[PDB]
């Protein structure tokens, strides 16, 4: 429990807070608001559980059944089922999972700061940090369709390297002026992908 408390005080230096940022009819605005609501709720749950494990591990506090299960999962290093809500690749270890969650929470903090001041259109979002990226893509298509008063079902995708998406990485290919060439590298990271609907 000494090293358990040591790691348990090591992790939450990457997790601080998140605001909840509510009268807007924009699909992107409401999608990002519900996204940050889910993120803030999950962050509050994780931080409260973490504080409970701090209290039961280094201090005076009785351990409940939930605390005993959480302590056992943290000792074994496997991700607890309560914390796992978004899609994680093949059950990642808690050490990398808390870093990924810190990255997602920092990203949502950047969205909250940008919305504190349309305004939310100019931001560049990494699709990895979002809890659901296909919903973001569909909301982007809805936003451009409603802002131009266009049909939803007749919109193709034009991809360049009015919305910026970062973190997309290729698999055995390279890009130069939107041209694909076969490469022996495992993954070449695209710097910034530009999505436009026509």
């Amino acid at each position: 429990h000494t090293t358990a408390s040591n790691w348990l005080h090591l992790i939450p230096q990457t997790l601080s807070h998140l605001k909840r940022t509510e009268n807007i009819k924009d699909p992107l605005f409401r999608f990002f608001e519900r996204e940050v609501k889910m993120g803030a709720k999950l962050l509050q749950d994780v931080r409260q559980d973490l504080a409970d494990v701090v209290q039961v591990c280094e201090g005076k506090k009785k351990q409940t059944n939930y605390l005993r299960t959480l302590i056992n999962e943290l000792v074994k290093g496997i991700l607890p089922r309560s914390w796992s809500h978004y899609t994680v690749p093949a059950g990642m270890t808690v050490i990398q999972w808390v870093s990924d969650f810190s990255e997602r929470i920092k990203q949502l903090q950047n969205i909250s700061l940008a919305a504190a001041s349309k305004e939310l259109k100019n931001i560049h979002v990494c699709l990895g940090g979002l809890f659901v990226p296909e919903a973001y893509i569909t909301a982007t298509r809805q936003y451009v369709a409603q802002a131009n008063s266009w049909s939803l079902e007749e919109l193709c995708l034009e991809v360049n390297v009015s919305f910026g998406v970062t973190g997309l990485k290729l698999q055995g290919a390279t890009c130069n002026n939107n041209k694909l060439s076969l490469s022996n590298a495992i993954s070449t990271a695209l710097p910034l992908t530009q999505l436009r609907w026509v």
Binding site: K25, P27, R30, F31, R34, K62, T64, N65, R68, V132, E134, A135, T138, A139, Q142, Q146, S151, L152, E153
Partner: protein, 1285 residues
């Protein structure tokens, strides 16, 4: 005058009963049986209703004797005739089989002799009843009850002993394998009555519901379906030859195929002479459509199109001509559908529109590329139909073909069914499964739930004219049951569509693989008097046999298919169907000008709705929801056009579709997704609008029923608006749906919602409504559905199966009523997946017995659940969903309900108790209205922490119990002071403080000392109520007395000295503050027989306090129960068997203790400890919740509702944080308040054991000066040992 009117009513009862005689009719010159049951039952029911009606009020006390004689005479005749109808019904078919069937005495001599004895007794009773048809004269014979019970028991005995003959009789006619034993004896016994056979053809044939007969019932003219469609035989079969039932029914089966072939030949000749013209006459087309049945018309259209395409490809002009003819016919179809039509031919026109649009798409695909020969695989891939009139065998004149697969049409009369929209996914499925069937291998589609697997298999089986059966197989599908249904399928020639095959207990699956291997080996031998060995018997195999397997890999950890069995089935993956195409074809078929526009607006609407809306466990936006929306849109368009015609026309198709979308999807939404969905509707359909209501009559009678049963009511923005609109949404989904599901936190008013809706529907439509409430977790799955005995193959019905079978049989006229089956428990895929084929459009329940129970149109299976966190999409998607949010039932609703129930319905059941109840309600109204005091105290108690998870309704019901105890105490004071009654001003100043004391012990009774002191000081800071001033003593330590002031419990506890004889006796309690407080509180709970839970650490004093409370009540008997981890409700059943007895009453069966006049209280010591299932449920806790809320349980032995008479519960438990303990469900905690008894602590322990030691150091009178240091040392060491270890 009122007494004379009542006497005239009883004289009219005398006249109508003495003029009432049993209407006997001759039964084929052998006997005289009693018929006309429904009128007698209705008259008896309404007489008993009237007798109870003037029993209650107002002058019943003067003429009690004759009314009591009338009511128990009516109960007796009701019981006699209830037994009598079943006895006669059993005897009729038993006599039929034992007379008409030969080789029975040669087979069952003892059974035949016993039945002859039974028949002689029955005939003697019939002579006796025919001597005196007067009902009182029949009642006058002594021994009728015992005689009828013995008769029924012996008839049931021979019923169970007749089972061995049924397999032998089934081996003759193959289709008998799909009916149960009782229905099969009905079939065999009524082989000469014939008119009783019309309700069993549904289970035996595909779409046959009745047979058209003659006046003498000597020939079978033809076959009619469920929808009224008729097929008339060319050469009718004659029963006037007196054949056996199997012989003439086999003749019927062959004759329908031959007749269907002849009509198909005539129809295809008609379409051949129609299709040669580039333009057609709609009048002649409609006359032909109305002339021929829907199956034959669709088949003729397909044959004509295939022949035209083949003649065109024989040789771009001919192919363009074929496409032009198809488009001309399609335009005629659309214009004919666009006007009003009769229903059956409208369905025919819809099927033709679907088939012709598929043919148009196929012809467009053929003409887009360059096709020149009939041997091209592009043409060979699609299904083709060939008809040669030169063939001399009329059954094989049509040859259905797909790519290298020659098929013969089965010519089974399918009725109407629903034609399936031919998606390209469906085309690929057709190709793969016809390839598997050509290769003599069963097909097996798989994928996620709700993609069109079993429906596409059924569509292929209907296209080939085959008989398809959908089995919802579960873990109890054994080797023997599977072998029985395989041999039945093989002898009939019907397809098998085993749905959800992977929940089948892997070893039994591997065992089934051997039978499947034998089946395909026999089929391959057929493909070139053949038999295969199934269950150690060589049986005939029809060439039409097929097995199809529907699976959902990765559903709920289902059983994996073995590699031995996987190689026998050809897999196809269907994961996404063309929603665009299915919506476009369905809208174009229903008739819509902008059909393609509406489809392109509705399918992406669902795609965006699945992603923009929140994620909840009960949302579904899949293909089943989309098809329900489309069908409801067609229905509402028909309703609107009928309303307009009542006044071509123009209809707002957009607004119609938005009305359907809102009507189906608005109820399932949470309160935060309503603006999001309405914004989505405004974005997709700009000129949308939204109008609702026009339900004024049902709304008015809903208000009437709500005012009747002490319920609050609203009109949209009043206090009851949300609840009333949720009831209206529930009514809409009952109207437009199949099986419902009401979802919400415990305390959302859903049970009251559906009860009030049922009674409002009663008062509106005038049709009787009966609701059966089943808890699915209080019994095992075996008791819920059924059990097959492995020793002898006999089926004992479960609870739900028994209820459904009773409704289907409708001996007591239950088909004409309104039956609602409510599963008031929680959902997990162990048992709800057996209802996969019920809630789906199959409309039937499948048992391992092979017997299928169709769902009658008046039955609406529905759920009342708290959450859907452990149920899968396969059962979420099949149910219409109503979401009862937690804020639907606001707290002022329950406040008003409590105040109304206080003002009416006196406790000791104008009256003095009613008057004091009204006075108490009128003096405690301002503390209940709006915020007041109770709502603020409750919202603060939510913010406090407690030993259990606090729900609002638990503490609120607890407060109501305390206030009822206050009213009872005031009545006790009034009875104790007859000269001076209770003065109103001190009654006011007493209730005003009892309410504070009661809210304290209600909202802080299950928490710690510091938290209850915190709630006390919060109440002191927040209320304007006179309170006892003390800088240190909290309000929790004060008692309110009958005088009206605060009395401390410190004056209540005495400084008693116990004798040395009983120093540490088990029943000796030295009283302390916590002891007397919990004593008074427990007495308050137990006086109203309200169940309770004693929570706290082990050894804190819970059972000691409970027994001290129970010893102050001499009318209660305590029975101790202990709950282990492996505790099952059989422990409660055994305790009820020991200490209680079962008594039959006219209103049901009741369970009461043997000690008359006493109350039995059951003490469960470890109520937390029963093991929780993997789906978060406890069987014992669900059982206790069922009998606490519903006031009874279901007896497993005979599936009869049992109501407890004098039974109440008390619970003891450790805190849920302890390692072995588990938290109780909030639905159970809604009823049982919790009080938290803690350790006494050092100050209380010092005096508690100082009294004991001061008493004990009196055997030695030289040590009494050491008692205090001895107690101090004992307490110090006990506290020190408790601290570390």
């Amino acid at each position: 005058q009122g007494e004379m009117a009542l006497e005239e009513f009883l004289k009219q009862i005398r006249e109508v009963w003495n003029t009432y005689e049993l209407d006997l009719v001759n039964y084929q010159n052998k006997c005289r049986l009693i018929r006309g049951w429904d009128d007698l039952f209705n008259k008896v029911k309404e007489h008993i209703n009237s007798v109870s009606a003037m029993k209650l009020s107002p002058y019943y006390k003067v003429f009690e004797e004759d009314a009591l004689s009338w009511e128990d005479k009516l109960n007796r005749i009701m019981a006699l005739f209830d037994v009598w109808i079943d006895v006669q019904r059993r005897w009729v078919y038993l006599e039929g089989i034992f007379t008409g069937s030969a080789d029975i005495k040669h087979l069952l001599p003892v059974e035949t002799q016993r039945f002859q004895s039974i028949s002689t007794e029955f005939l003697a009773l019939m002579k006796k009843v025919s001597k005196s048809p007067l009902v009182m004269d029949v009642l006058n014979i002594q021994g009728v009850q015992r005689s009828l019970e013995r008769l029924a028991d012996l008839l049931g005995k021979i019923q169970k002993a007749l089972g061995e003959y049924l397999e032998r009789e089934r081996s003759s006619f193959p289709r008998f394998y799909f009916v149960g034993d009782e229905d099969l004896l009905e079939i065999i016994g009524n082989s000469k009555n014939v008119a009783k056979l019309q309700k069993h053809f549904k289970k035996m044939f595909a779409g046959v519901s009745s047979i058209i007969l003659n006046e003498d019932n000597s020939v079978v003219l033809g076959i009619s379906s469920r929808e009224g469609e008729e097929v008339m035989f060319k050469t009718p079969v004659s029963i006037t030859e007196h054949p056996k039932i199997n012989e003439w029914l086999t003749l019927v089966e062959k004759e329908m195929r031959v007749t269907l072939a002849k009509l198909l030949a005539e129809s295809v000749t008609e379409v051949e002479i129609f299709g040669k013209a580039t333009s057609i006459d709609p009048n002649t087309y409609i006359t032909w459509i109305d002339k021929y049945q829907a199956q034959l018309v669709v088949l003729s259209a397909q044959i004509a199109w295939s022949e035209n395409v083949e003649t065109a490809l024989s040789s771009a002009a001919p192919l363009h001509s074929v496409l032009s003819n198809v488009e001309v016919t399609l335009n005629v179809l659309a214009d004919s559908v666009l006007m009003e039509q009769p229903p059956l031919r409208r369905r025919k026109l819809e099927h033709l529109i679907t088939e012709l649009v598929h043919q148009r798409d196929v012809t467009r695909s053929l003409i887009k590329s360059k096709i020149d020969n009939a041997k091209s695989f592009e043409w060979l891939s699609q299904m083709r139909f060939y008809f040669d009139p030169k063939q001399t065998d009329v059954l094989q004149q049509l040859s259905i073909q797909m790519a290298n697969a020659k098929f013969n049409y089965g010519f089974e009369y399918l009725g109407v069914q629903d034609k399936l929209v031919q998606t390209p996914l469906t085309d690929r499925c057709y190709l793969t499964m016809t390839q598997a069937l050509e290769a003599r291998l069963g097909g097996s589609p798989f994928g996620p739930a709700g993609t069109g697997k079993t429906e596409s298999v059924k569509a292929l089986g209907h296209q080939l004219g085959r008989f398809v059966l959908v089995f919802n197989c579960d873990e109890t599908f054994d080797f023997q049951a599977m072998g029985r249904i395989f041999v039945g399928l093989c002898q009939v020639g019907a397809w098998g569509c085993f749905d959800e095959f992977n929940r089948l207990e892997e070893r039994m699956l591997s065992a089934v693989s051997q039978q499947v291997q034998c089946i395909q080996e026999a089929l391959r031998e057929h493909s070139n008097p053949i038999t295969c060995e199934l269950l150690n018997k060589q049986v005939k195999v029809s060439p039409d046999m097929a097995i199809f397997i529907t699976m959902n890999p990765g559903y709920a950890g289902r059983s994996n298919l073995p590699d031995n069995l996987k190689k026998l089935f050809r897999s196809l993956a269907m994961t996404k169907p063309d929603r665009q195409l299915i919506a476009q074809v369905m809208l174009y078929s229903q008739g819509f000008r902008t059909a393609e526009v509406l489809a392109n607006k509705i399918v992406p609407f669902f795609k965006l709705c699945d992603e923009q809306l929140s994620s909840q466990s009960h949302y579904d936006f899949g293909l089943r929801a989309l098809k329900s929306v489309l069908v409801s849109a067609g229905n509402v368009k028909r309703e609107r056009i009928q309303k307009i015609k009542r006044e071509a026309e123009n209809l707002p198709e957009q607004e119609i579709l938005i009305q359907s979308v809102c009507e189906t999807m608005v109820p399932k939404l949470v309160a935060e997704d309503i603006p999001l969905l309405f914004s989505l509707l405004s974005d997709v359909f700009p000129g949308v609008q939204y109008h609702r209501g026009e339900m004024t009559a049902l709304r008015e009678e809903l208000k009437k029923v709500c005012q009747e049963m002490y319920l609050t009511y609203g009109d949209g923005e009043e206090v009851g608006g949300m609840w009333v609109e949720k009831v209206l949404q529930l009514y809409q989904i009952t109207q437009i749906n199949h099986g419902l599901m009401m979802v919400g936190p415990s305390g959302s008013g859903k049970s009251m919602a559906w009860r009030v809706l049922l009674k409002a529907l009663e008062r509106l439509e005038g049709v009787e409504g009966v609701a059966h409430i089943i808890d699915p977790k209080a019994i095992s799955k075996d008791h819920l559905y059924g059990t097959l005995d492995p020793n002898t193959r006999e089926w004992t019905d479960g609870l739900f199966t028994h209820v459904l079978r009773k409704i289907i049989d409708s001996v007591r006229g239950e088909l004409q009523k309104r039956q609602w089956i409510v599963f008031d428990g929680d959902v997990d895929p162990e048992w709800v997946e057996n209802l996969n084929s019920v809630l789906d459009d199959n409309k039937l329940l499948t048992l391992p017995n092979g017997e299928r129970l169709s769902l009658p149109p008046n039955v609406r299976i529905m759920f009342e659940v708290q959450d859907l966190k452990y149920a899968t999409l396969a059962t979420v998607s099949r149910c219409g969903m109503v979401w009862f949010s937690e804020d639907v039932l606001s707290t002022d609703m329950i406040f008003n309900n409590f105040l109304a129930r206080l003002r009416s319905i006196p406790l000791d059941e104008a009256s003095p108790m009613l008057q004091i109840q009204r006075d108490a309600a009128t003096i405690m109204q301002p503390y209940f209205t709006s915020n007041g005091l109770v709502t603020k105290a409750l919202e603060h108690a939510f913010q406090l922490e407690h030993i259990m998870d606090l729900t609002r309704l638990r503490c609120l019901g607890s407060l109501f119990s305390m206030l009822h105890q206050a009213c009872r105490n005031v009545a006790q004071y009034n009875a104790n002071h007859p000269d001076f009654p209770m003065q109103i001003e001190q009654l006011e100043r007493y209730i005003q403080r009892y309410l504070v004391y009661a809210i304290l012990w209600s909202l802080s009774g299950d928490s710690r000392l510091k938290m209850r002191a915190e709630l006390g000081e919060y109440i002191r800071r927040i209320t304007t109520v006179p309170l006892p001033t003390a800088p240190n003593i909290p309000i929790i330590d004060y008692e309110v007395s009958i005088s009206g002031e605060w009395s401390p419990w410190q004056a209540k506890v005495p400084q008693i000295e116990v004798e040395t004889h009983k120093v540490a006796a088990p029943d000796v309690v030295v009283p302390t503050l916590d002891t007397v407080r919990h004593e008074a509180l427990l007495y308050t709970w137990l006086a109203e027989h309200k169940p309770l839970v004693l929570c706290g650490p082990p050894g804190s004093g819970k059972t000691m306090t409970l027994f001290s409370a129970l010893r102050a009540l001499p009318d209660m008997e305590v029975v101790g129960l202990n709950f282990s981890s492996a505790t099952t409700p059989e422990l409660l059943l055994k305790t009820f068997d020991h200490y209680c007895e079962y008594r039959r009453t006219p209103n049901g069966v009741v369970l009461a203790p043997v000690q008359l006049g006493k109350w039995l209280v059951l003490f469960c010591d470890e109520i937390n400890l029963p093991d929780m299932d993997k789906y978060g449920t406890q069987r014992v806790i669900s059982f206790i919740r069922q009998m606490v809320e519903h006031g009874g349980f279901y007896r497993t032995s005979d599936q009869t509702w049992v109501k407890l008479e004098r039974i109440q519960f008390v619970g003891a438990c450790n805190p849920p944080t302890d390692p072995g303990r588990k938290p109780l469900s909030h639905r159970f905690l809604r009823h049982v308040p919790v009080v938290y008894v803690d350790y006494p602590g050092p100050a209380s322990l010092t005096q508690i054991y100082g009294t004991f030691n001061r008493a004990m150091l009196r055997l030695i009178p030289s040590l009494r000066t050491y008692a205090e240091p001895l107690t101090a040392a004992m307490v110090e060491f006990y506290t020190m040992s408790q601290e570390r270890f």
